[PDB]
Amino acid sequence: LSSFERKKLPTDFDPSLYDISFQQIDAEQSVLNGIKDENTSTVVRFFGVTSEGHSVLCNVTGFKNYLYVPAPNSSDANDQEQINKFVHYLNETFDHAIDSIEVVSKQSIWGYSGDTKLPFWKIYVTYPHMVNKLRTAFERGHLSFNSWFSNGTTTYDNIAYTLRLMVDCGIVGMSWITLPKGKYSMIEPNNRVSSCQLEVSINYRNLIAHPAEGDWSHTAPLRIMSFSISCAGRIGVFPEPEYDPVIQIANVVSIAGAKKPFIRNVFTLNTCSPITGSMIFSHATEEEMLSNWRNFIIKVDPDVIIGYNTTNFDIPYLLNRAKALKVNDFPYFGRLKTVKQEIKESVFSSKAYGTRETKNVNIDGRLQLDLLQFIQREYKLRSYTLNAVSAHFLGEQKEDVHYSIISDLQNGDSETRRRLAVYCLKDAYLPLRLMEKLMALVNYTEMARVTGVPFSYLLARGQQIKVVSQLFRKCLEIDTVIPNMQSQASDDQYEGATVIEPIRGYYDVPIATLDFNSLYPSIMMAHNLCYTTLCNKATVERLNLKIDEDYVITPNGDYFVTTKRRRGILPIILDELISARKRAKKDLRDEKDPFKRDVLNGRQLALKISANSVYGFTGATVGKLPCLAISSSVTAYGRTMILKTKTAVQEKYCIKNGYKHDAVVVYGDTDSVMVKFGTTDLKEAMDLGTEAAKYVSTLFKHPINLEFEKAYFPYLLINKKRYAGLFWTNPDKFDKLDQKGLASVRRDSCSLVSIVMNKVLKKILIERNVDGALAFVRETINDILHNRVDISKLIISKTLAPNYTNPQPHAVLAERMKRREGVGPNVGDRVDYVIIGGNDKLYNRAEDPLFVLENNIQVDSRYYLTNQLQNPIISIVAPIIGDKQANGMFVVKSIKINTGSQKGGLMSFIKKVEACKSCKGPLRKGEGPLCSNCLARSGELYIKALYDVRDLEEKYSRLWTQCQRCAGNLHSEVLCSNKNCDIFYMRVKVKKELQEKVEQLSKW
DNA sequence: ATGACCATGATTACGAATTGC
DNA sequence: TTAAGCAATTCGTAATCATGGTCAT
């Protein structure tokens, strides 16, 4: 519509006289045509965009998936005619798939056995899918030519064809490529299959693949398209694609690095009133809307389709709805004009990521950056709803329209549909703001450029594929082949680290903190630890290597060789990763905005996970190339290093050498040692910690380096891997209040515990007044016992698991929700609940907070007092006031049994005899709120009731007026379903409580 | 009369969750 | 066909084991 299509390249164009330099985004292998280049037909399409905005479909042609096998050590194997007869037999076996066989000189990645290279047969195939068969035969024994490979030789260099091409040519994902002058060609308009402005093809040996450093580090003007849908379903049921139509589709298409999107459209099902600042396309039937949205996607040519819960709800619902409406022309909204976009259900499983079930869609040529998955992977939040996330990062608890009323807003006037459209537009613009604040695209681009994987791998693949790609690249650059070691079944665990005993107590003395700079990567790159340096006793005896100069032995007992024999490739990969992390931390150093500070911290934190993921992959039994020797060696080195630094810092800083006190290693967490020098001064403690870290780094190998990071003036060591204190990096002002492992920074504890622990630690460490902290704890206990705590602060969230042997509360809750509502949280979702009161097991006492808010069922206050708040508060206040004095304040001296508006099986048809006040005398036959015995207090109880009513009515007015201000509307009703707003769960509670207190005041 | 048997705390074990490096 | 590692704490539920209250004897 004169504003959607990209800029058309100059019409004075030709396959010559122009160099199409473009930054690829997507890579996909597919057959090209009946023609064959380099004796093969399959190609790798590189969907990208140039520096101006012209979408390119560079076809890389003429690459055959080669397979490395050990050349047979037979006399008749170096013969040319024998190789010819063997390749003829191979062709006759699978009907002419193999192309040729190149005898190369290459060495294995496994172990060092001299600088000699073995003869390796590099077998080509016309189409790559043959290798998976061919390789398999070489490991089963289904090939017998002169009984060469009948026993089964271990194959080598097993990877997919796309990554194979990218590794051979050097095309790291999201990098810059360039087609030289005229060497490429352009596909005829009667054979172009994509909707791109270009459709070219070039043999792989001609193009130049630029690195992502220097002149070729910039990005391309990507057309990011954020979108959302809104569907009006039947009453009391979840939206299903068979009966509940899509009523609105909002699209907020923008550009990478742009401060504002260039279009805001709302494809509506009926006539929609105009919305200032956005376009509106109002249709008549749903088929027309779907077809026009498809044509709109095709027209705009978006490089990325970002959104929230798009891969799981939006796009699958749209596809299934188009299928149900017999719109057979909808699912072709990819960069290819003939292939379908279909839903394939995959399952991801990882220890650090949890089991998830994703419904992926094959949207070709366009990246996908579903913000839900990106935030589940990068950040650890209590809830992962759009409202909770928008309140966490952006910080706005805006209104979320009720779901049941949607069916009555679409069936109304045009202004009802207009406000529906503005809701949809806000929902569709939220993911753009999220991606711009979190810097998702920049971080993931840096990641895909350092590791060298396709962008799409960062969301559907773990940390193994990155180290795999890095290893393959470094191997290709060093003439080495990676064997296809069959992954072992499993293992229980190997020996990790040796966490030092945590001397508990309260430490007002400044505790310095000295930790290692990337301990495990430093250990790896410091001792020449890799796959290619792993010798054994037989090897060193056969080669006659000198000890401590040519080869070394690790504390685990394994053998390696010094850098004088062979430089590993894991050291090089780790050098690359730490040089990336150095600049990622320098950028954080040169940055002021606290939100951008946290973003750069997350960026740095993801570059030290991969540097640790190298060691994790070397130790990962489940996965290719599991070399437990190297992981065990680095763990042994780390243990011995922390023990040695503990000994050294306890030895040098003592009385004899001329120091004031005796330095004591208070705590150690496998890389850090929190030495206590004794000096109550803080600046002196910082200087001594710096000097100690420097002296310790003096006693280690070059890549290793200990650094003074922080100091804890008030230090509260609760237990092992659990403590808190004040962060003092400067002797003039504390930075923050740390809480490691405590129940506050956890997620399976109600937010009330977090708030209480934060306030208590603030009063104890910052202000140093334990009396006020104890008074606040007593007030909190009284609030809990008297039902004075909001439901929103009593919500516990737990991550659901696929299978459960021992029943859990959230699992049974999800099952009951599925049986009752109609749909429940699948695996991987954080189910939230509150613990209602009852008699049966705890897993049978858990309910949806909305069900509790609706049914007014009481909350188990004693459970939250004793099981949720008692233990953490006790553990944090006992090192100050003793155990018994701390536990005494948790006795239940007061209770409030609600028994109100709970009409059910028995709580209905029951009376309230309305006993007397302030004495509860049942002899209240005489009317009035007081009995004749205690009538002298008739002037105080009325004061109490009236002031309770005053506070309640003030709070009620504030809350409801605030709700109206938030809803933007004053003359309309605010039916808001947003349960992530602190005022939610509270307005209704205050309304009920004020109703009861007013009815109690009406007795006088 | 003497243990028998049922009911009620200690103790151990392991699943489940989350966080710490 | 695909998935970094381990160390550590905390809580819930069951299984098992010591010990007492009361009864046929």
Ligand SMILES: Cc1cn([C@H]2CC[C@@H](COP(=O)(O)OP(=O)(O)OP(=O)(O)O)O2)c(=O)[nH]c1=O
């Ligand atoms: C966080 C994390 C850590 N590890 C291991 C690996 C070694 C130690 C050191 O970890 P640390 O976070 O303190 O940080 P560190 O790199 O040592 O140091 P600096 O910030 O560079 O100073 O922990 C891991 O395997 N997976 C992880 O996700």
Ligand code: SF4
């Ligand atoms: S509870 Fe109030 S502030 Fe929160 S979303 Fe609803 S109307 Fe807005």
Ligand SMILES: [Mg+2]
């Ligand atoms: Mg560290």
Ligand SMILES: [Mg+2]
């Ligand atoms: Mg640490």
Ligand SMILES: [Zn+2]
């Ligand atoms: Zn009375």
